[PDB]
């Protein structure tokens, strides 16, 4: 089932999942004081 690929030919075999860096919803940091309602992102979850 393994097939020899080619010169210039991985884009085909794989799908090269691209990277991603989204940090909207500012991260929780103890250096800041928060009020009731302030929303933060911790561990990828909004609280």
């Amino acid at each position: 089932k393994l097939r020899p690929l080619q010169v210039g030919g991985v884009p085909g075999c794989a799908n090269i999942p691209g990277g991603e860096d989204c940090q909207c919803w500012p991260e929780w940091t103890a250096d800041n004081g928060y009020f009731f309602g302030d929303v933060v992102q911790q561990g990828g979850v909004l609280y």
Binding site: R3, L5, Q6, G9, P11, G12, C13
Partner: protein, 494 residues
Amino acid sequence: DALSDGFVRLCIDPSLNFFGEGCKILVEGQMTDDGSATPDAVTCVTSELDIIERFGQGSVLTESLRKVFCTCKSGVSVYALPREDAAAGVKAVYTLTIAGPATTDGRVQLYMGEAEYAVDIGVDAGDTATDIAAAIVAAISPDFPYAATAAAGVITLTARNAGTIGNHLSVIYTNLGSCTSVTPEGVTVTFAQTTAGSVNPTPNDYATVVNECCFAVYVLSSDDTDWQENLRDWIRSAWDCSKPQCFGHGYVFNKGTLGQVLADGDNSAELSRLALPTTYPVLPYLTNAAYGALSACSTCNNPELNIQGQTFGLLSCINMPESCTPGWTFGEVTQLQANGFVVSGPSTTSGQGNYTSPYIYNDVTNYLRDEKNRPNATFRDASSRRLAAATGVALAEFLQQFNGLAVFTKNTNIRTGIIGTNPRLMLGKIRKWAQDNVGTLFSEFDNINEDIQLLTDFEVQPKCVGQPGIFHLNMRYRPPVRGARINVNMAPAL
């Protein structure tokens, strides 16, 4: 620089011939309008660089000249007789259909005409017909005698030269499976040839463009039968009795099925008809010109050896793809050998691995039967023709010591002191010249007492008609014999 004295004078120059012109060949073909050479005029060619601008890029004469220069390396003075396209000519157009999105990796190789025009694209997993056609058009060599235009799957190849010489195109995939270098799933590329003929030129002006320029070999790059018949008439006029003779030979081709190729033949002892099967991959004029050049760059200093066999008759510049079905079946092969036709085969028949060079058998001429009607093989093979020419020239140079000498016909007694001669002494001297050439120009004469006759003009002609100082010589030679078939018949015992 210690050369000041003036005793020795250096002339360091890499472009200097030492061995004369040598072995004049003439290549006849059609050209395009891009060239800068005046049509219908024999010119000299010195290299393979200026041919593009002189005969147009992509013209059949350009490829003919390129193959001539590829084969005959050095020793020949090549000339070209470029002619232009006839008025009414539909430039041949071929369609090639590609297809099949794409599915995997591999190389897609195509073979059009000769191997020098082969292309190799790198179609990989995922592609589209349009892009494949674009890559093909970008990969086609510009020297290919066809202009390529893409139609997103319909590659259109139009012939750069109008005439019947364009109806001989072939494209082979030579990769389907092909035992290695596997193909990306595309399509079975389809070859269709929508267009057609529209008759090519017919010059018939050899008696003017070349008047006394003695050429050794004429090659023709057109499939018109009337043109070849005109060339035959010319070369036959070169082997006349009226005027002094510029001996010559001509090399032409004939492509088609067995019926039409046996019909193309006649008793033309002046041409070497080359037969070609209907499914011939290589463009015909290429192999024709290669054969012509080889036979001119290997024999002109040695006019005895036949262009034949694995070593001598090898056309190294022509490259065909391998195949197991070899065009002419052996029955057709022997049928063509019998009716004075040159046949060509492969030289490796290696299944499916790579290109192979063609190879000729039976370097013969189209001389079946004698002038009266009788069959005979005196002018069957071309080496007999070149040998007869050489022998005639040698005898002519030997006989020059008599033209100008005092001759005695009556009373036969050369008085003391004078420098005359009589017919018996001339006959003896000619007999000894013919004799001490046995082994290089003649064979083991059988009845020399009557093979050579010298008659004074006072007896050949009727009474009171002869002219003092005219002689008639009749000679019956026999070119040497060589090796041929062996016919082994090995038979083991119990």
